[PDB]
Nucleic acid binder design. Structure first.
Lengths: 1326, 451
DNA sequence: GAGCAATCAGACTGAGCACGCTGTGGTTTGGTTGCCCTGCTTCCTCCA
DNA sequence: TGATGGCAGAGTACTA
DNA sequence: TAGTACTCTGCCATCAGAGCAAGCACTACGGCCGATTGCTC
RNA sequence: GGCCGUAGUGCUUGCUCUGAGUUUUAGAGCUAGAAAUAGCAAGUUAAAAUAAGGCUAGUCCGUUAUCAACUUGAAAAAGUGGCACCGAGUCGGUGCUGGAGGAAGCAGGGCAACCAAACCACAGCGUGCUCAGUCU
């Protein structure tokens, strides 16, 4: 037995580990090897790393689930429509629905005529001639008053119901309102009529252009206000305009309503708010509000339709028909123009589906943007195409009726068209008149987001309670589903519990009991001093009572001055009182109590005790429920308590926020001695005046024990469950689980003895988003920089360009404009100096012409410049091009600059980890490792857990020439773990006083101490520190510079490091989601059981779950003889369950006969095999191999490459270039090492020849460039899948191993999570 | 002619003997003894072939029988100094750990030779071959010792336990002596005149005249033959004045030193590493009893070996090396101590190193018995010369007890510090030096520097 | 006049208190130096 | 949002 | 000489959007704060 | 400072919806040529599927997490693998038992001298701060 420590380094996809002794030396032992090969033992160093694929979130799975539910519900809607229509469809045409169901079927497979609607070619052709598109039929049905065929009626209704619009806008949208400026003039007329004291005229004002502008709503409102005399922003007219356009204004100022008076037309609860406001203001302004409503309707309807509505009641269909006619006319004109002016490309343009153009636009997959890109130059190089080019620029050239922009059509337009059709055709068909309501409900029903899936107890993602067990249909959803209970469960299913008592639900934040608890908790910890008192005295129980009854229930905020005067001076009659232990103003107050007092107007009711349950229920309902209707239906039982007015006011009130203390914890539990609750003690507990923490931690009382028992008893879980339950990224959670498992195995390995120390460290860790953010900011600010020169997303990915665009092309420190073309010449300056903290995000980076304009070169920007650019940044913030924190940092100086305390804090954090994720990992490891208590039931710290930041190890490597290159091999994970252990152990040995802030368990003086915490490793600091380093108090030697550096160099240069890549069974989608056209191939997968791929298309490229080794016999040749064959079979994800259910039959179906169950071997991905002279290959799939060997380049060459390439960019730098120049001859040796390793293992002859030829031809280039390009060459000899790299100009493609036959005669190695335990299975015997 | 007369006593004729007299012995286990097992440590090729013939011969003799037991400790091929006999000795670490511990009774070599009186001049050295193998092991405790031996030629693979008591067991050297003791104990009752020295496995018979040794040898062979022990005849010095025993030459009743040993010490060149010097000192230290003033003579070399010192071979170390080389060349002949007569010890102390010689009366002269020398402890190093001699006597007087067997001697020293102990200018020293039963001071007189 | 937006009692004397330094004294802890043991450990022969 | 494994097609070569 | 069989190399990968609720982790301030002053409508 | 709030960013989980995209089919292609072939005409739309599918038959569920080998197990899960040293191209080799003797280093414990520091109590003093009196 020997004392040892385990060092770990955690990444998103790698977990290094290392065992060291007391002298910082990695041990080594022989490990037994199982299996059937001759080898029975193997020697391995106790240091390595585990590599695995990164974890994934559930976002994609959730999206897929939502899509599936959406498709199911759409099919159910169509089924409802067919069920309604069947009774008469049976008489009109019996097989109509049958023909519809089998439209997707070849002619031979069809059981009816190939024509769906009428069943005969003549009628089909006639119908398609009369109505070329479905919108023509919809308009004809809406407008005509004569009888129409039931089949066509059903077709139109089915289209409308299937493709409904968006449900964003709620309420009603009368399509008849389609004017913009005429209706605005009507509104102005009504405004003048009502408010005749002052005239308001909009003559000569482009109201239509102002309102229809593409700018922001606020910008449009500001422009309209500016272009209107006699009124300013926030006026009555301005508020009406804002309400009409969508903004939510407060009309309180307009009518001095002394209330919120905020009305958002779109929200339906605000419809009731508008109702109450009309109640307030009588009827005069009611008509004005109706006019505003009409205006808003007309605005949005014109925006989305752009067609007149008076002539026809089918505005959307008419617009689609107009678009169709324009498409036809434009197409004919373009055909004629091309044929006349340029007949050399009519073919390519209108017939070639491979290239873009009309043919690729219609028959091919080209989109509108690609079509416009292809057709623009031809249009420009022509004559008489001015209007065509104008339409192209306006995005109105050759448009399809069904397009990506059709997402702005509200479902109310489709509802209106459907209702018009139903009204027209209800006379001839009585059942259409009788089922109008239910058809419209079919169209306009959607399940509320709080009800969720309508399961029946067999769905995990389901919360719902049903008043009756009948089937749910949209026509009895209200009568079956208990929406109130559904919503309550919705909310309560995601809230948290009380950790003190992890069984009860937390209380609402604004709960009255919570308010009382906080008030008393803050009140019990105050002490006062008055004349004639020996010492300060705690607040008596009766004193607290009186104070609560006279101050908190009478004023919103309690201040110590009011406490002293209103009570101590008046009641206690002590003029001289000195309060202590409390701030001038108290933090907690009965905020909810005052809110209800002004509504219910019953102090007796609010103070009475027997209605506290009622009050708690009231606040719980208000917090839980968000919709007014459900709030009212829940408060119906309490309608008797308060009049209708009070009930309406309650429904208006809305509390949001959940507390952190369960009711049981606050009030239910009672002390055994006296049966007093926490609230009772807080009200009066003798004269000790203990607070909540003291009460729960007191040993004399039973609160502590009782809480502890409940917690521990109910606290049970498994490692995996707990790790997943933690909060963080799934990749980090996976890394944590892997780290725990490797720790357990390392402990098993080292004689089942727990380590003395465990040192851990974890690493810290869009173009479309940038485009949308910059677009929104430009629209908000009204700028035209994007219009000056549009920029694509790929270009915007550049950091410099992004900064330039965010700054609106102006310097952040001076009021000047920068030039885009003159970029790559200025400097990027962080707001906070890089020395204080390390942050290269956009939130801290600022681009300026000269970095010497931030005032002080270190402190935050200078005051004056900050003030001027502070107005400019208030502007940029209203524009949202910068964040709250960014603005704060930028404007910090004015309030104050970086103080010495701030510098100290910044530097301190850079060396101390405070992340909750690291704290959780450390706590888990501590609880697992240390489980033995002492005589006083106190855990004994047998093992100490230490957490370090990566900065210490990086500084160590840079300082003592241990440079790390990540592109050489995967040994750097293991090296980082080893260095982490070494540094942590040395630090805790040298400074035992810092265990508090490192081990899990004045400013100026602090500055130099933390800055020089790692100085004892250095030799010459000119101070000459002693060779040996003692603890400083005891005699323990912590660092002997004479040898420990030699030891570290030897350990980092060991050519054997256990790199193990975790084998995983592939899971996920069955195959690629693309549906390919029909072709004669066996790779296609049928999309349904009877849709033969060779006639209907299908998927392809199925993902293999795990390969299976099968030894059997197949039939080859006409003789059908049995030839012994051993081969790898890939069990795809789709057929995995079928294979597992009966492997014998699954294999026999594929053609193999007489398989061997014993010889069947399951091979997951990344399975290892050794061949030849140490060559190792991993298993990517049943037909491809990955590399599995690592190159152990000498540390001397590693350091030379680092220094020559200048990784991460005077006398110290002077010697580095001289050193490189002296050792120029290392590049040839590095190339030789790469060549020999590739010859021995990689076996890519052509790629090796190309690499060597490129190196020979590029021998004259600078050493810096040569080393930088040689760093790339290591991609040839790496671990994992082949990948393409580049050497100067020459590029080298992948060399893939698409054959998996040799591995069948190799040695199969099963490696544990650390790789020290192996099971070598020889496959040649099979 | 001796081989013919006693066919039942010689190992060449009798062969693998058996401890007929003693019953099978049960090996007790510690209170917490629990079965343990470990896979046999793979043995080296040449080492594997060394033990294989013995296993075949041990199987024939019945010592090794196939068995299946939960205890299985590996076998160790301890190569003999001569060639590589690779005796099959079990590692037996676990068993030694699991087995109990009993009181030991093996005699230390520094006393056996003390019992030999100079009167008996005729010697007979007998060595019992396979000594440990003689004692039988009860089948109940046989599973305790086992090892895995698989040879395709033999055709048997598994555990081969020991029916006797094998080598390595930490209590084997004790039981054999105890068991063999009572056996030879009665022989002394039959032949009180003779003086038989019972080593662990070497029996030396001392007699007065040549005929007395011959009579004892014939009687001794018959007794051992009946008892079942078998002695090797190849190396058995019988009725010879010059005999080799316990690493010491025995001639004219003097504990001579072998000429071959002296060659080894001088043969080595000047050491260059602390290991080399330790090897030399190890060889030298076995002969400390012959070199006068060995402690002061080799004083320089000691600190050269010091664990944390530098091997900067000093001229004083060279002078020290030469002193040992020349001292061993003319080493005197230490006589065998006679317990009947009183002893005499000379004590001297110079420069913090105590030296002296233990002598006994030989006619009118005194014959050296053993040279005693010691480094004084640092506390006594700083004492004045008058007090330093008192400490030197106590250190050397303790050494004499390990050879005189507690018998008193004449403490002779140049000074008269014997009265100083009574009235010093330390309580432990007074009791040791004032015990008239075990120590006394004769006439004060100087002594020759060589002595 | 009403609103939004920062800004965040001077001197002298006295007593009383806070940080630091100093003198006296009591107590506690710690250290070196010296003498003793107990113990543990490492290095070299001579034999089974 | 890049990888990295599947796929089709062209080329070469071995065998009935 | 035609039929399998293996190797090599370029291509290919379902995408946008809108609401609501809960939780965590982290960073920025502010707060006690009255009375005075400023300016602006 | 604590505490208290809030303001914002990011991320995670769940639910309800939208627009497209893809695949097969319907939308009679015509003329001259036996034919390939050539010339014209047409194009915008619709139906169905949107992971195969499952039983629990719901307007439900189906892509997240977890997973070396072997033994015991129904499963949840539990068990399975000597140490030391000299080395180093992916790890190689060597060693291993007792007893006895001689020499050397080491750490710990006790005891008696001498010494430092610390705390506390009293008293004094330099500097600074709060409060009170006076003038303003």
């Amino acid at each position: 037995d020997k004392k040892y420590s385990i060092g770990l380094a955690i990444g998103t996809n790698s977990v290094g580990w290392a065992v060291i002794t007391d002298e910082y030396k990695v041990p080594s032992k022989k490990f037994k090897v199982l299996g059937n090969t001759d080898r029975h033992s193997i020697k391995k160093n106790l240091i390595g790393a585990l590599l695995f694929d990164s974890g994934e979130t559930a976002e994609a799975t959730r999206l897929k689930r939502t899509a599936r539910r959406r498709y199911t519900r759409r099919k159910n809607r169509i089924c409802y429509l067919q069920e309604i229509f069947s009774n008469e469809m049976a008489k009109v045409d019996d097989s109509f629905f049958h023909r519809l169901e089998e439209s997707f079927l070849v002619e031979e497979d069809k059981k009816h005529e190939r024509h769906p609607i009428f069943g005969n070619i003549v009628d089909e052709v006639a119908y398609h001639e009369k109505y070329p598109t479905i919108y023509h039929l919809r308009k004809k049905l809406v407008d005509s008053t004569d009888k129409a065929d039931l089949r066509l009626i059903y077709l139109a209704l089915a289209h409308m119901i299937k493709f409904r619009g968006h449900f964003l806008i709620e309420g009603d949208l009368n399509p008849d309102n389609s004017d913009v400026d005429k209706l605005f003039i009507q509104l102005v007329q009504t405004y003048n009529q009502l408010f005749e004291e002052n005239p308001i005229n909009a003559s000569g004002v482009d109201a239509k252009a102002i309102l229809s502008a593409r700018l922001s709503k606020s910008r449009r409102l500001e422009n309209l206000i500016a272009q209107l005399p006699g009124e300013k922003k926030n006026g009555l007219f301005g508020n009406l305009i804002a309400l009409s356009l969508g903004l939510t204004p407060n009309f309180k100022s307009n009518f001095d309503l002394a209330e919120d008076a905020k009305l958002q037309l779109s929200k339906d609860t605000y419809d009731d708010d508008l109702d109450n406001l009309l109640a307030q203001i009588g009827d005069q302004y009611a008509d004005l509000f109706l006019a505003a409503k009409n205006l808003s309707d007309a605005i949005l309807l014109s925006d989305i339709l752009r067609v007149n509505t008076e002539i026809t009641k089918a505005p959307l269909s008419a617009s689609m028909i107009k678009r169709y006619d324009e498409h036809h006319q434009d197409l004919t004109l373009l055909k004629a123009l091309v044929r006349q002016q340029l007949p050399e490309k009519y073919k390519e343009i209108f017939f070639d589906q491979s290239k873009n153009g009309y043919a690729g636009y219609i028959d091919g997959g080209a989109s509108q943007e690609e079509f416009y890109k292809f057709i623009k130059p031809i249009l420009e190089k022509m004559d008489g195409t001015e209007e065509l080019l104008v339409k192209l620029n306006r995005e109105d050239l050759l448009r399809k009726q069904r397009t990506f922009d059709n997402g702005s059509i509200p479902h109310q337009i489709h509802l209106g068209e459907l209702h018009a059709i139903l009204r027209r055709q209800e006379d001839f068909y009585p059942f259409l008149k009788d089922n109008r309501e239910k058809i419209e409900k079919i169209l306009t029903f959607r399940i509320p987001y709080y009800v969720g899936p309508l399961a029946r107890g067999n769905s995990r993602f389901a919360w719902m309670t049903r008043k009756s067990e009948e089937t749910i249909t949209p026509w009895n959803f209200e009568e079956v589903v208990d929406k109130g209970a559904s919503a309550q469960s919705f909310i309560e299913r995601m809230t948290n519990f009380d950790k003190n008592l992890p069984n009860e639900k937390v209380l609402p934040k604004h709960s009255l009991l919570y308010e009382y608890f906080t008030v008393y908790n803050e009140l019990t910890k105050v002490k006062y001093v008055t004349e004639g008192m020996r010492k300060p005295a705690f607040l008596s129980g009766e004193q607290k009572k009186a104070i609560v009854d006279l101050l908190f229930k009478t004023n919103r905020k309690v201040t110590v001055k009011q406490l002293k005067e209103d009570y101590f001076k008046k009641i206690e009659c002590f003029d001289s009182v000195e309060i202590s232990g409390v701030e001038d103003r108290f933090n907690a107050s009965l905020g909810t109590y005052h809110d209800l007092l002004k509504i219910i107007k019953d102090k007796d009711f609010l103070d009475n005790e027997e209605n506290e349950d009622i009050l708690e229920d009231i606040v719980l309902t208000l917090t839980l429920f968000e919709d007014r209707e459900m709030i009212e239906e829940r408060l119906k039982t309490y309608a008797h308590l308060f009049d209708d007015k009070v009930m309406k006011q309650l429904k208006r009130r809305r509390y949001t926020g959940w507390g952190r203390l369960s009711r049981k914890l606050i009030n239910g539990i009672r002390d055994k001695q006296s049966g007093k609750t926490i609230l009772d003690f807080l009200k009066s507990d003798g004269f000790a005046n203990r607070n909540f923490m003291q009460l729960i931690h007191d040993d004399s009382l039973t609160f502590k024990e009782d809480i502890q028992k409940a917690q521990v008893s109910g606290q049970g879980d498994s490692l995996h469950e707990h790790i997943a339950n933690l909060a963080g990224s799934p990749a980090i959670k996976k890394g944590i689980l892997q780290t725990v498992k490797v720790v357990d195995e390392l402990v098993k390995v080292m004689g089942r003895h727990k380590p003395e120390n465990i040192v851990i460290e974890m690493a810290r860790e869009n173009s479309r988003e940038r485009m949308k953010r910059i677009e929104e900011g430009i629209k908000e600010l009204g700028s035209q920089i994007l219009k000056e020169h549009p920029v694509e997303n790929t270009q915007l990915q550049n950091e410099k360009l992004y900064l330039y665009y965010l700054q609106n092309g102006r310097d952040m420190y001076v009021d000047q404009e920068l030039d885009i073309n003159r970029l790559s010449d200025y400097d990027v300056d962080a707001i906070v100096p890089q020395s204080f903290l390390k942050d290269d995000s956009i939130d801290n980076k600022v681009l300026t012409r000269s970095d010497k304009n931030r005032g002080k070169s270190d402190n935050v920007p200078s005051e004056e410049v900050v003030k001027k650019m502070k107005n400019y940044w208030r502007q940029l913030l209203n524009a949202k091009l910068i964040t709250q924190r960014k603005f704060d940092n930028l404007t910090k100086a004015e309030r104050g600059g970086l103080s010495e305390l701030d510098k100290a804090g910044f530097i301190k954090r850079q060396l101390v980890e405070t992340r909750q994720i690291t704290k959780h990992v450390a706590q888990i490891l501590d609880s697992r490792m240390n489980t033995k208590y002492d005589e006083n039931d106190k855990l004994i710290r047998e093992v100490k857990v230490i957490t370090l930041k990566s900065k210490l190890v990086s500084d160590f490597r840079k300082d003592f020439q241990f440079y790390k290159v990540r592109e050489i091999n995967n040994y750097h994970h293991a090296h980082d773990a080893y260095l982490n252990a070494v540094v942590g152990t040395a630090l805790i040995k040298k400074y035992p006083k810092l265990e508090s802030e490192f081990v899990y368990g004045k400013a100026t003086a602090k500055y130099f101490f933390y800055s020089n915490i790692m100085n004892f490793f250095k030799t010459e600091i000119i101070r000459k520190r002693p060779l040996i380093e003692t603890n400083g108090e005891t005699g323990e030697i912590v660092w002997d510079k004479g040898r420990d550096f030699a030891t570290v160099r030897k350990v980092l240069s060991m050519p054997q490091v256990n790199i193990v890549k975790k084998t995983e069974v592939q899971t996920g989608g069955f195959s690629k989601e693309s549906i390919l056209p029909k072709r004669n191939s066996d790779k296609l997968i049928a999309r349904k059981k009877d849709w033969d791929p060779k006639k209907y298309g299908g998927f392809d490229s199925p993902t293999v779950a795990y390969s299976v080794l099968v030894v059997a016999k197949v039939e080859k040749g006409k003789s059908k003889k049995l030839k012994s064959v051993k081969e790898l079979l890939g069990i795809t994800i789709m057929e995995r369950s079928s294979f597992e259910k009966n492997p014998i039959d699954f294999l026999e179906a594929k053609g193999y006969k007489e398989v061997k169950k014993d010889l069947i071997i399951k091979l997951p991905k990344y399975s290892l095999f050794e061949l030849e002279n140490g060559r190792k290959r991993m298993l990517a799939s049943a037909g491809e191999l990955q590399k599995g060997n690592e190159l152990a380049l000498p540390s001397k060459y590693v350091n030379f490459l680092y220094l020559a390439s200048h990784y991460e960019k005077p006398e110290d730098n002077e010697q580095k270039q001289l050193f490189v120049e002296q050792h120029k001859h290392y590049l040839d040796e590095i190339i030789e090492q790469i060549s020999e390793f590739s010859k021995r293992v990689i076996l890519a002859d052509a790629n090796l020849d190309k690499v060597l030829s490129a190196y020979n031809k590029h021998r004259d280039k600078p050493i810096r460039e040569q080393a930088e390009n040689i760093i790339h060459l290591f991609t040839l000899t790496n671990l994992g899948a082949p990948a393409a790299f580049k050497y100067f100009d020459t590029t080298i493609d992948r060399k893939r191993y698409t054959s998996t036959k040799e591995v069948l005669d190799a040695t199969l190695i099963h490696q544990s999570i650390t790789g020290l335990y192996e099971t070598r299975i020889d496959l040649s015997q099979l | 002619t001796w081989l013919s007369d006693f066919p039942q006593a010689w190992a060449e004729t009798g062969g693998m003997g058996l401890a007929v007299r003693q019953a099978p012995l049960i090996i007790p286990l510690k209170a917490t003894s629990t079965p343990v097992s470990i896979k046999q440590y793979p043995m080296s090729q040449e080492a594997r072939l060394g033990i294989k013939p013995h296993i075949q011969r041990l199987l024939d003799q019945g010592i090794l029988v196939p068995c299946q037991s939960p205890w299985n400790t590996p076998l160790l091929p301890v190569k003999k100094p001569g060639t590589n006999d690779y005796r099959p000795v079990q590692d037996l670490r676990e068993v030694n750990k699991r087995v109990e511990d009993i009181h030991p009774t093996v005699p230390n070599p520094y006393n056996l030779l003390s019992g030999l009186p100079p009167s008996h001049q005729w010697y007979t050295v007998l060595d019992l071959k396979d000594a440990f193998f003689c004692l039988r092991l009860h089948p109940t405790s046989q599973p305790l010792f086992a090892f895995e031996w698989r040879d395709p030629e033999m055709g048997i693979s598994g555990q081969l336990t020991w029916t006797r008591l094998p080598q390595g067991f930490k209590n084997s050297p004790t039981l054999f002596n105890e068991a063999l003791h009572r056996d030879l104990a009665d022989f002394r009752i039959q032949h009180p005149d003779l003086i038989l020295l019972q080593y662990v496995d070497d029996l030396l018979l001392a007699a007065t005249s040549e005929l007395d040794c011959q009579q004892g040898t014939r009687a001794l062979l018959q007794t051992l033959g009946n008892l079942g022990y078998r002695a090797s005849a190849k190396k058995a010095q019988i009725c010879q004045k010059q005999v080799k025993y316990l690493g010491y030459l025995l001639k004219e009743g003097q504990r001579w030193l072998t000429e071959a040993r002296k060659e080894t010490v001088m043969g080595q060149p000047t050491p260059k590493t602390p290991r080399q010097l330790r090897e030399f000192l190890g060889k030298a230290g076995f002969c400390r009893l012959f070199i006068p003033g060995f402690a002061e003579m080799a004083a320089p070399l000691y600190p050269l070996t010091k664990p944390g010192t530098l091997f900067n071979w000093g001229p004083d170390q060279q002078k020290a090396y030469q002193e040992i080389k020349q001292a061993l060349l003319t080493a005197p002949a230490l006589g065998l101590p006679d317990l009947t007569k009183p002893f005499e010890l000379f004590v001297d102390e110079k420069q913090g190193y105590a030296k002296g010689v233990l002598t006994q009366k030989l006619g009118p002269w005194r014959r050296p018995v053993a040279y005693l020398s010691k480094k004084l402890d640092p506390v006594a190093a700083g004492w004045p010369p008058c007090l330093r001699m008192v400490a030197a006597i106590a250190v050397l007087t303790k050494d004499a007890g390990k050879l005189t067997m507690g018998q008193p001697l004449v403490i002779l020293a140049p000074h008269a510090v014997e009265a100083l102990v009574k009235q010093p200018p330390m309580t432990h020293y007074q009791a040791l030096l004032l015990d008239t039963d075990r120590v006394q001071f004769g006439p004060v007189v100087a002594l020759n520097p060589a002595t």
